[PDB]
Each structure stands twice: as C-alpha cells, then as structure tokens.
Design a binder for this molecule. Structure first.
Ligand code: EH8
Length: 123
C-alpha cells in the first residue's frame, strides 16, 4: 500500500485522459485498496467532476497529484504527437481540476469531510 483515504491522485481509466481523483473507501467493501482477481493491487478512487463516479484502479494507473501542471509530465511517461481534447470531456476535466486545486489547499481530514461521496442504495 502507497496511498491512503483522502490522498489526491491522477487516475488513467478506460478511454479517459489522466484524471484528478481522491482515494476513498469502497462503500460496500469498506476498504480503499485491494488485491484484484489477477493478483495486482488496486485503489478505490472518486473522480473529481460535475458527474460523481468512483472506480477501482490498478496501482500502475494511479499517480500522486502534485498539481494540475503535472498533466504534461504524465503525457511524457508514454515530431511530438498529441491526442486532441474533446470539448464536453475537457469541460468536465476543467471542473475536476478546479475541485482538485481547491482540495490540494486543504488538509487530508478537511478533504475527506468536503468530498467523500454519500451513497444511496437503489430502492
Ligand atoms: C475519468 N473517468 C474514468 N472513468 C469514468 C467513469 C466511471 C464510471 C462511470 C462513468 C465514468 C470517468 C469520469 C467520471 C466522472 N466524470 C468524468 C469522467
């Protein structure tokens, strides 16, 4: 384990770009980290966005979030070739970054209080 609840991280999931997240405890498993069915470590994250969502992410797809300007360094990990940025997606990413920049100014306990999602079971 390298991340704990309330840590700010970037996650690279599915078809999405590196995205600002907060590590959190899964509402059902009550753990923020686990070993998956392939034997690899995963972390439970919340995506910062206008659309609240969560996911289990392979440790190789998680990075410490030091600030929004780190995005360039993450693209460097992979003429220069750049993927274009789709409009709706860029708008949600900018919202997520604005929240992550606000969260970076808080303590870990403050972030946990401000951002941990409330989960409501389908009735
Ligand atoms: C970056 N990202 C990777 N997966 C998701 C996602 C997960 C489950 C359902 C839907 C999307 C998102 C995302 C989440 C919220 N806002 C923007 C992107």
């Amino acid at each position: 384990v390298k991340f704990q609840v309330g840590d700010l991280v970037w996650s690279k999931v599915g078809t999405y770009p590196w995205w600002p997240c907060m590590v959190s405890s899964d509402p059902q498993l009550e753990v923020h980290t686990k070993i998956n069915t392939r034997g690899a470590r995963e972390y439970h994250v919340q995506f910062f966005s206008n659309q609240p969502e969560r996911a289990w992410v392979h440790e190789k797809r998680v990075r410490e979030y030091k600030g929004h300007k780190q995005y360039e360094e993450l693209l460097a990990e992979a003429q220069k070739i750049r993927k274009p940025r789709p409009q709706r997606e860029r708008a949600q990413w900018d919202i997520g970054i604005a929240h992550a920049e606000k969260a970076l100014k808080m303590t870990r306990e403050e972030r946990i209080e401000q951002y941990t999602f409330i989960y409501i079971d389908k009735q």
